[PDB]
Amino acid sequence: ADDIPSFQNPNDWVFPWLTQDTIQIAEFYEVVEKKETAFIYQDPVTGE
Amino acid sequence: ENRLESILSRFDADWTASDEARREAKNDLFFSRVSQWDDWLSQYT
Amino acid sequence: ALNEGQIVTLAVDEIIETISAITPMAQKAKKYTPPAASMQRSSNTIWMPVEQE
Amino acid sequence: TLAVDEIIETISAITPMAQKAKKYTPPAASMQRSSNTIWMPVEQESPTQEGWDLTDKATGLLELNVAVNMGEPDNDFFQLRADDLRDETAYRRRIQSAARKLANNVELKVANMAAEMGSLVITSPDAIGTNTADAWNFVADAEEIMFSRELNRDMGTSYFFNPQDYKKAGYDLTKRDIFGRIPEEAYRDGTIQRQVAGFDDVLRSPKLPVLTKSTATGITVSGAQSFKPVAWQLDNDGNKVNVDNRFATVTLSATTGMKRGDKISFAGVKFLGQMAKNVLAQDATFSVVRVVDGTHVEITPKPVALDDVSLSPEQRAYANVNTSLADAMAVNILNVKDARTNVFWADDAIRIVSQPIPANHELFAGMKTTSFSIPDVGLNGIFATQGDISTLSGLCRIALWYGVNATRPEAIGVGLPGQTA
């Protein structure tokens, strides 16, 4: 928390009188489509 | 190669691509919510 | 040996950081954003009152 | 004043050489830092020693290279006035004509470079229409000089006639007093044949240059000279800088009357069998590329001597000329008379490097940049438009950044009929 972050401000010059005194950070979501190993078990109750 | 640089490049590309629509949408929100008089360049009177 | 081959130059792009400064006073100072574009004339200033005694 | 939209089309040009030339698009990101120059290796030739005891006779490895680069954009800048009506009537047709002219310019650059950096030179003492099958002999001389030198022709070969010599070949075919299949084709149409004397693509080209004669005479080599194959050499700072393999600066008595494009041949130097290193019966021909200073020139085939004792065995493995220059060897000029050049080559000898002009960047605001695909020649340029009211007009610019390169000047050739007098 001591290391205050910063990022591209989406609110350029809010114009009442004074700034919101805010802190900006970002969350980057990324989707990776890939083949991963799957295990074929046998269900002890029923079903292959 | 740098993860920071790759993320920043992607973000900057999208940010500069969506620049006009975002500006128009922000102007629409301000117009519909706060005030319809945007007069700060008119301060010469 | 005497392998008189081909010579290239490899400029790779992992930069070497050298500068890391801090701004402890500007962050503490409050920011203001008035909508007055006439201040370019430098004779147009904002007047604010002082607490009365 | 009655006026219509009907267009009286006036010109229709063909671009076979630019179409056939391979087009290269190396990465622009690397080319920006590499000063628009990229190096490619050359097929390696190995030496050979026979014997039993070979102590302290182990050679090294040497692989030479060439470099390809580009020139400057070939634009179509023009200003267009909004109020005028003859400009609104002509804007789009002007754009189309600009595309056609850019393609024509690319073809002209290809033809001139091929005819000016063509090492192999075939010459005739008279016109093509002199003796029967003289056009066939002209093509066969080129095919034989490519065969004897053992030049790689896997991609294919090509021969471009000029229209006059093509007509002469057709006339020779049709005056045969017989009509089989080739004579009937040459009668009904002007085409001689699609393949002649071993070439797999024989065409005619309206944009082949005319090689103006050289006034140079009485020139001899000044000082015995030796040219050594090498890949890199040390500069002033000790750094190794690469060396191009398709150039050699010779010192003559006086380079007066020489220009870029003349063909020379020293008295005594003979071609070699490249791979086998067998002395041929043909004089070695070189093309002067650049006339630097007043007593030096730059010839495109580097004359590596088989009999040079200052060459290491790996360097001598690349020898293409049976001897060196000996301070008095008279140089004979081959183009002693004007002639429109016929040009033959191997299909993998001329390439066209191309690069994009990234004017779509956010830097260039206020002007609109799009792409522009040139027809005929398969190239890309940019089409950029800006406005102005200081003159109440608009500027349109069609830019194209490319460069023709002759990677194997020893593969390209030049045919010169009627080099008498």
CATH code assigned at D299: 2.40.30.240
**Dihedral angle of Cα D300, D301, D304, D307, to the nearest 10 degrees:** -120
Query: Which contiguous run of DSSP H or E holds residue D387?
Result: strand D379-388
Cited resolution, angstroms: 3.2
Contact D60 C1 (CB under 8 A): yes
User: Cα dihedral sign for D403, D404, D410, D411?
Assistant: positive
Indicate the SS3 state at residue C34.
coil
Q: Do the beta carbons of residue D49 and residue D313 sit within 8 Å? A: yes
Which are the contacts of C51, defined by CB distance < 8 A and separation ≥ 6?
none
The residue assigned the tokens 């191997």 is D346
Provide the 8-state DSSP code for D125: S
Tokens of C5: 């081959």
Burial of A47 (0-12, 13-18, 19+ CB in 10 A): exposed
Cβ atoms of D338 and D213 within 8 Å: the answer is yes
Among all residues of chain B, which has the CA nearest to that of C39? B43
* Closest residue, chain D, to C9 (C-alpha): D34
Q: Quick check: D65 and C1 CB within 8 A?
A: no
List, in sequence order, every residue forming a beta bridge with D283; answer none if it has no partner. Answer: D270
Centre a 10 Å sphere on the Cβ of residue D382 and count the other Cβ atoms it contains.
20
Pairing mode, strands D240-242 and D286-290: unpaired
Question: What are the tokens at D193?
Answer: 């044949």
Both tokens of D120, joined, read 């192999």
**Is D205 within 8 Å of D148 (Cβ atoms)?**
no
In angstroms, rounded to a whole number, what is the distance separating the alpha carbons of residues D389 and B32?
A: 36
What are the tokens at D392? Answer: 């109440």
Does the CB of A28 have a partner CB in chain B at under 8 Å?
A: yes
Burial tier of D414 (Cβ tally within 10 Å: 0-12, 13-18, 19+):
buried
All residues at 6 or more sequence positions from D275 whose CB lies less than 8 Å from its CB, including other chains: D45, D150
Our CA dihedral for D181, D183, D186, D187, rounded to 10 degrees, sits at: -110
- Cα distance between residue D212 and residue D286, in whole Å: 17
Picking from D317, D320, D235, the residue whose alpha carbon sits closest to that of residue D286 is: D320
Q: D200 near D157, Cβ under 8 Å?
A: yes
Strand D393-399 relative to strand D22-24: parallel, antiparallel, unpaired? unpaired
In chain D, what residues touch C4 (CB-CB under 8 Å)? 60-63, 230-232, 314
The whole-angstrom separation of Cα D56 and Cα D59 is 9
Size of chain B, expressed as the number of residues it contains: 45
- Give the residue carrying structure tokens 């000898």: D349
Q: Quick count: other Cβ atoms within 10 Å of Cβ D303?
A: 22
Tokens 């503490």 sit at which residue?
C28
Instruction: Indicate yes or no: CB of A15 within 8 angstroms of CB of C35.
Output: yes
- Min Cα distance C4 → chain A (Å) is 45
What single letter denotes the amino acid at residue D130?
T
Top residue of C38, C42, C43, C45 to mutate, by most chain B CBs within 10 Å, is: C38
Q: Residue holding tokens 């003289």? A: D134
- Between chain C and chain D, the number of residue pairs with CB atoms below 8 A apart is 33
User: Breaks in chain A at C–N > 2.5 Å: after which residues?
Assistant: none
Determine the residue type at A23: I
Cα–Cα nearest to D360, from D369, D351, D373: D369
Domain that holds residue D294: 211-339+408-416
Q: Supply D345's token pair.
A: 């080559």
Number of C-alpha atoms within 13 angstroms, CB side, residue B36?
1
Q: Is the CB of A28 less than 8 angstroms away from the CB of B40?
A: no
Q: Which two tokens stand for residue A42?
A: 């046998």
- Phi, psi angle pair for D398, to nearest 5°: -110, 105
DSSP label at residue D240: E
- Bridge partners of D80, per DSSP, are D394
Give the technique used to solve this structure: cryo-EM
Q: How many CB atoms lie within 10 A of CB D356?
A: 13
Q: How many angstroms separate the CA atoms of D23 and D29, rounded?
A: 18
Question: Helix or strand or coil: residue A44?
Answer: coil
